[PDB]
């Protein structure tokens, strides 16, 4: 039940709670934070001109096959992503790949 601490399903989809580190060598999931209930995501983009947000959304849109929007934390390392029109079961399956 590893990724479950970072996700919740609302009427609109799944809110995936992440904590980003920019300037990374590769955009990828590197861990979970068990106290904050967030997936640690490295993002291979600079945190300028919204480029880390853009890369983060692109990565998860490709992973889930669904539109991903930042609902909270646009200017924070702690960001909540709405994965629109997907279920928690589908998100867990994809995160576990």
Residue ranges binding Na ion (CB under 5 A): 47, 50, 52-53
| Nearest CA-CA partner of 17 in 28, 25, 6, 33 | 6
Q: Which residue is nearest to Na ion (CB)?
A: 52
Q: How far is the CB of 53 from Na ion (least distance, A)?
A: 4
**DSSP single-letter state for residue 56:** H
Q: How far is the CB of 70 from Na ion (least distance, A)?
A: 9
Cα separation values, 5 from 14, 16, 56, 77, 80, Å: 12, 9, 19, 18, 13
Please, which residue, 6 or 53, has the CB nearer to Na ion?
53
Q: How far is the CB of 35 from Na ion (least distance, A)?
A: 24
Q: What's the distance, CA 82 to chain centroid?
A: 8
What's the rounded Cα separation, in Å, for the pair 51 and 12?
25
Please, which residue, 8 or 72, has the CB nearer to Na ion?
72
Q: How far is the CB of 79 from Na ion (least distance, A)?
A: 9
Please, which residue, 5 or 50, has the CB nearer to Na ion?
50
């Amino acid at each position: 039940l590893y990724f479950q601490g970072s996700l919740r399903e609302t009427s609109e989809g799944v809110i995936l709670s992440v904590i980003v580190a920019p300037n990374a060598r590769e955009t990828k999931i590197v861990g979970i934070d068990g106290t904050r209930g967030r997936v640690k995501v490295n993002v291979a983009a600079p945190p300028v001109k919204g480029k880390a947000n853009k890369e983060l959304m692109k990565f998860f849109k490709k992973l889930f096959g669904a539109e991903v929007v930042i609902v909270r934390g646009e200017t924070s390392r702690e960001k909540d992503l709405l994965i629109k029109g997907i279920t928690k079961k589908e998100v867990i399956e994809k995160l576990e790949l």
